[PDB]
Ligand binder design. Structure first.
Ligand code: FAD
Ligand code: FAD
Ligand code: FAD
Ligand code: TPP
Ligand code: TPP
Ligand code: TPP
Ligand code: MG
Ligand code: MG
Ligand code: MG
Lengths: 571, 571, 571
């Protein structure tokens, strides 16, 4: 005997949601009232709803549990969209409650009329309009279940008037927490795979976030067959610690070693991955892909053998079927290549007379940050530096907009994080473009008392300078940001602001920002690091290729792009 | 290496498709040429593309293997839509190749311009436009995989010009047939379920098509705990043979027994089901749902415990954890109720002085049809009669538009069937509305040499006559079909036509139609059977409920709707 | 001949676009290069793309000419969406260039994959994906034309690779500026209307933005038949100056006079309007609607006579057919009622001992602002105050998100404005929620050297406090903003910041902010003004009505909502 909104709120509480991120409107009165009368779920008001979505995503990513955000009708919920894409593409359980204009006015071009039911189709698993209160029990049941079990976004579109109507009287608000099933491939499929591996000399693994929770099984497997392990970016935090077979990552921002490893493998085995750079994959090697989601299978390479399976349970069952290989010439050669590849990683990662090198900053961040710190990195150079310098260990974490690829993710994701783990240290490696893109929500660290440690890579620019040639006469209005003082801004927002201009000052700023009890923004003025490009590659680019689409990589030094050549590892 | 079309066709052949259903256009020349030069995949030309879709669905349903249909650009592929919905809603693997207008003209309101990429979003798991031939390998890989492994429709939209361009040279055409994984819930979840079952007295099962292939496990489980088994319509062919615990089906067209069984159960266990009639579900019983697809869970009832799981492997694991219950008072009372409920099923199922009773026809069809015949039934009364009279045995099959609920499915599905199993007997129980709705494709049984046995329930009407009161003054233009002679039409199409007007002639017509070597249409003139409705129910209907939404059922006799009353069973 | 991007850019230049608002990406390299090599169109880089859209809209609104914005692939262009809705709903010509992921990767879940072609359907007149460079000439031709002539948004979705390919060689880049036609209803329709008006005693007009450019014709017509003129908000700047028949506006934020005027009219004539509050319209009066867009006709009221027509040319033709009415008892009574209604408008609009009253601030803004200043107001209280206190005169202008109803519009629209009219004074009446919602783009007034005068109504809250009852125990996290100092923030961004806390200081701050040569943010701390609501109305609200949906208005004083009662006017 309650409102539809109340019914939703109570069901959510049973499912265990602790908070709902968003921004109020009249179209959400039903939900507000219920939330207030209930006093159990905390309303996290943000300054732009886009940040609410991002945060919810981060919260879900860290907690592993359903997270919720909401938006008023019209522009309210629409503001969620970019964030929801990030949630969805990052495979985290997020329910989004999109309040809607009053039923009666629908179809008449009413004030604020949008069609959320339609808009969010792409960034969701489920998206329905609750026209009649009678449908709330089944609509919500599915939405939640899919979001949670299919690992993604669900959207419930709820007109303000409907939300205030009485929920069905017989409806159950109790939620049964149904965990993922055990999904392992058939014994026959496994036996095939084992024969296949047994007949392959140079075996290689490309590992992604799908390998989370399976680290033990992963290394054991790799060890048993002496197969090197390359990882995709999102697999970094789950794979690149305690790993004797680590050959790093590849792609433009990784290291050549991983590429050469796959181009010299007889058999390449994709394990829970969506590594998207098709040109980095062997053309004439047997590619075997294991993944829990059929839609992943062959999205980015050919597949000679595909197995639907949970990486953990699959490897558990596969191990007894795979005999120990003793030959490790391939593995050793790879490891060697990777060590040789991190040559020059240190080149610019040191204190400097003039401008501060980004790589130095990143190196120091990884050094002084907590051994269990949660990092976030803006899409832009912070993502490059975060991926190359942050040392993972299986306690620390790394969030970013790695699949949806949105600027300005770093701080908003950081809010989400901090709120979920208020005891833990959260470090946002932000761009100055990205920090300013959603700068309003900086005010949220104060208002929400969330002690995130923002570190802006203040380079007064959007991305690597001179994507071709340093320009002494040309200056695209596109890449140039007006010299700004974010420490000064942090200060005027009621947050500790540390401005850093000399390399000598870095270690001090970081150490202090981390130990201070509260929000700190560390405005570090870094160099406008350039990226030299071979004229041969500039040529390819004009045909319609980005550096990500070419067989090209950023050097360990980080100041130029070089062609990956065919390297046949001697017989 | 070849054309994009050829690449597709060859990949399909590797995956083992034997035929592609559709209707040619210039927009499909690439595909035609390739198909012709290849000579391996048979092009099944239909008269309306809608039937190609339907057929493909039936082919997929029977074979359990990927099936394909295609349509020209514009109206061509659009004609598929209704059929594709049926394929999709029936959970069968179907790839639809939707030819598209020439790239260049897109966006200009060209001759035949539609946007297939958008239109089929709802009836599909995957829907993409192949703009550049470069994307065909990954687009097709995903489409096929999803279609096959997620059990549904995928759509590839392919402009005629793109189809003629060269496929990527490095592309692999070999397909690895990856089977479904073994998906069973965790041991702890199972233990909970077992303890739950162990402390329940009156346990009941509602079983759906998800139980296919698990008949042995099903009965054993039901037997062990002495739990009666009600089935949903689509579970009929997989559940209602060799089943000591059979309590029939419910819903408007079933029998009361199933309803009373659930309303008197302490614990109700949904096994692979999507039975949609929410009012037929117990309000105050523990509902436990097992299903392979999280989106199914709680779609139509509350769920106190939900388990993601394959019904077969789940029951295999659950059995050793469930101790044998000896008390079977509940089971026995149910069985009794069901036998008591098929009272009057025979009432009208006998030869008659005047018009021929539909129930008689159906009874006789089930009697003279092959012991392994494949049936199909039009949405309409043929669905009612097919469900009540066809005796299943685990060899026979039953296809219909049970979820998408489209008229005129019977014959087109029948074509699909016959083509997949040319040795087998296929019987289409068609409505006269449904047979005429896509009557053009009757010409396809000739042209395709497919010996389907059409049986039209010629009642000169759309559905049950007098959904309220026989009208001696009123006659809605809505329900009345102009007296037609389909035997005569069959004859003029080059197909054996048997006209049947006297009950005495039925057994002879059927026996002959089945034994003749080829297509036979049996035009049976059946009664305009009425459906009396209590004035109390007519009242409810005016509030906005159909008979499916009420706690109401059709009598065993089949000539009136009666309210299901609350029934309590002693001890 | 050149690249597709260049082709676009050059065509745009011919059409006369002066700038393109957005934020760069690699997916826009083609467009960047062309823009740079061309040096004619200025790239206005914003901090969030949402603001680029908003601005473009404001630029289009002011200039009356096509305006353009653009976004990178994926999150880039998606950031435009909310703004584009505002552009579209405000009926302004805006082309949006949405860069897209590389063709080849489409359909594979590539990095940043979205489907812009679909997403923007709702906020646009035209939305197409340029797959082949061959289609750019017709796609762009239509997009531009529709955008311009149908007065709304068009979207061209352009993959980065396609943009770099050669445009069709034969393509014309010259644009013919085709002006709107003369659209007047047929003489017979006009004669009917004239006879209708001739036999009506109490005639009333409700006028909207459609009346722009027709002020002379409007008053003359109203004068001739002695008909009072109520206006909709968006008609304000075009109607409420030099108007002897002005009866103000209605709706929640207007004045009762307009409502009573229509409820006492025999004939009500809607002129170019989309006033959306259906409850404010007479039930028993002849409603006559004239509008240029058939979709407007009857959207919000019944229509006894509808005429498709341009308000200007229609009135020109209608005048000679309408004989002068001498009776003006109705008109006079209305005018009187309106003067009586602005009773209490002044109540709180004066210097105060304690907190500063918003109405005072607004009154003073209208007083010290330029006689031809361009205002903008955030959705929220600034919209209320802007509408009640800003005196229009036919030179000044007023922009807001009046139809799409988005927070945070004020400043971003203000940027657009200032850039289009760099000589003119632009005043953004911003909320503190709205200013902070897109606060990043505050950095744009510096970087773009745009001397907008921001005036924040710093009330530390979201909207009217206590939408029911001041809460001395309750405090919704929903409405409460953490006390912030925006003057201090303005300062740290390199912009003059004036903090204002005492009413006595207002006139000085305003006068100085306006005369200073450059950006000034005036952070005025205003009262948390309350809005008392009758318990009778709170009741109605719980049924599912907002104050906008009820026959209710905000008092002239502005501190409470009062029910509009039925009023009958003698003779
Ligand atoms: C600026 C920038 C540059 C980048 N450059 C690079 C680069 O050079 N190198 C690089 O690697 N990345 C790079 N990326 C990131 C890249 O876009 C992808 O995010 C990353 O490559 C994908 O990692 P993943 O496959 O682990 O991601 P995810 O999408 O997280 O992988 C999850 C996959 O595993 C499957 N899965 C999940 N759970 C299980 C399970 N239990 N069992 C089996 N399967 C499971 C899922 O179905 C899915 O397919 C870059 C990103 C940015 C922003
Ligand atoms: C005119 C008409 C009247 C009808 N009246 C009735 C009626 O009176 N009574 C009635 O019952 N129906 C009736 N229906 C049919 C009804 O609409 C449904 O189609 C049917 O009831 C549902 O059957 P189902 O649950 O087996 O459906 P399906 O959709 O076939 O059920 C499959 C479910 O099992 C799951 N599943 C599949 N494979 C597995 C697996 N390996 N492991 C675990 N789970 C799996 C799927 O996720 C899905 O949820 C009628 C239809 C028509 C056209
Ligand atoms: C917080 C808030 C509160 C609000 N409260 C109120 C309120 O109390 N009162 C109020 O009035 N508004 C209010 N509004 C605004 C309201 O939502 C509408 O935006 C506004 O009322 C409608 O103005 P309009 O009819 O001029 O709109 P528009 O959409 O600008 O009207 C244009 C109409 O005229 C037609 N037209 C255009 N050109 C021509 C032509 N040449 N010839 C003929 N026809 C043409 C168009 O087809 C269209 O139908 C509020 C807005 C906000 C944000
Ligand atoms: C919303 C959005 N707009 C544009 C892009 C394209 N893009 C990617 S990185 C980048 C520059 C990022 O600048 P900044 O935040 O300053 O980080 P930097 O690379 O300079 O460290 C742009 C414009 C994007 N990925 N997302
Ligand atoms: C395309 C379509 N139109 C309408 C309906 C609704 N409908 C269901 S059964 C039916 C009558 C079917 O008539 P017929 O084929 O004669 O079967 P009968 O019940 O008469 O045997 C209609 C119109 C539907 N399900 N599908
Ligand atoms: C994006 C968005 N979110 C929510 C709303 C609903 N809404 C309308 S006004 C408002 C408060 C605006 O606050 P502020 O900017 O402080 O203006 P004030 O009324 O406080 O002056 C909200 C949340 C909206 N219109 N748009
Ligand atoms: Mg930067
Ligand atoms: Mg019939
Ligand atoms: Mg405010």
């Amino acid at each position: 005997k309650q409102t539809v909104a109340a019914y939703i709120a109570k069901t959510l509480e049973s499912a265990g949601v602790k908070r709902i991120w968003g921004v109020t409107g009249d179209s959400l009165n039903g939900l507000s009232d219920s939330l207030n009368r209930m006093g159990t779920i905390e309303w996290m008001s943000t300054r732009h709803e886009e940040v609410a979505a991002f945060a919810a995503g981060a919260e879900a990513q860290l907690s592993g549990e359903l997270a919720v955000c909401a938006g008023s009708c019209g522009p309210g919920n629409l503001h969620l969209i970019n964030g929801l894409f990030d949630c969805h593409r990052n495979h985290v359980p997020v329910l989004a409650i999109a309040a809607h204009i009053p039923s009666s006015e629908i179809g008449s071009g009413y004030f604020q009329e949008t069609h959320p039911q339609e808009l969010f189709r792409e960034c969701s698993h489920y998206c329905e309009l609750v026209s009649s209160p009678e449908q709330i029990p089944q609509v919500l049941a599915i939405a939640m279940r899919k979001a949670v079990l299919n690992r993604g976004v669900s959207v419930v579109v709820l007109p303000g008037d409907v939300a205030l109507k009485p929920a069905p009287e017989g409806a159950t608000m109790h939620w049964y927490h149904a965990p993922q099933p055990v999904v392992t491939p058939e014994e026959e499929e496994l036996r095939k795979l084992a024969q296949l591996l047994r007949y392959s000399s140079n075996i290689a693994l490309m590992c992604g976030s799908g390998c989370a929770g399976a680290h033990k099984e992963l290394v054991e497997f790799a060890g048993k067959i002496k197969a090197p392990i390359v990882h995709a970016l999102r697999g970094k935090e789950h794979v690149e610690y305690d790993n004797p077979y680590d050959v790093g990552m590849t792609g433009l921002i990784g290291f050549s070693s991983g590429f050469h490893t796959m181009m010299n493998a007889d058999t390449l085995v994709l394990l829970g991955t969506q590594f998207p750079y098709r040109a980095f994959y062997p053309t004439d090697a047997k590619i075997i892909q294991i993944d829990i989601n059929p839609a992943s299978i062959g999205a980015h390479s050919k597949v000679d053998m595909a197995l639907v399976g949970d990486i953990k349970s699959t490897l558990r069952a596969l191990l007894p079927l795979v005999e120990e290989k003793a030959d490790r010439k391939f593995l050793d050669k790879a490891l060697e290549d990777y060590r040789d590849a991190r040559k020059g990683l240190d080149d610019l990662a040191k204190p400097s007379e003039k401008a501060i090198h980004p790589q130095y900053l990143a190196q120091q961040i990884s050094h002084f940050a907590a051994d269990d710190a949660i990092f976030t990195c803006d899409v832009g150079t912070p993502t490059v530096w975060a991926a190359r310098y942050l040392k993972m260990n299986g306690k620390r974490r790394l969030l970013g907009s790695f699949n949806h690829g949105s600027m300005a993710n770093a701080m908003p994701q950081a809010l989400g994080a901090q709120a979920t783990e208020p005891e833990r240290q959260v470090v946002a490696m932000c761009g100055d473009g990205g920090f300013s893109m959603l700068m309003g929500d900086f005010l949220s660290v104060v208002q929400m008392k969330l002690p995130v440690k923002i570190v802006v890579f203040n380079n007064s620019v959007l991305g690597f300078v001179a994507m071709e040639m340093k320009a002494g006469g040309y200056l695209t209005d596109g890449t140039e940001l007006h010299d700004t003082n974010f420490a000064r801004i942090a200060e005027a927002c009621g947050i500790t602001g540390i401005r850093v201009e000399k390399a000598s000052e870095v270690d001090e700023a970081l150490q202090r920002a981390f130990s201070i009890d509260g929000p700190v923004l560390v405005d570090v003025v870094v160099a406008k690091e350039e990226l030299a490009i071979p004229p041969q590659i500039k040529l390819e680019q004009a045909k319609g290729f980005s550096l990500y689409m070419l067989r090209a990589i950023i050097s360990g030094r980080g100041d130029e792009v070089i062609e990956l050549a065919k390297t046949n590892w001697l017989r």
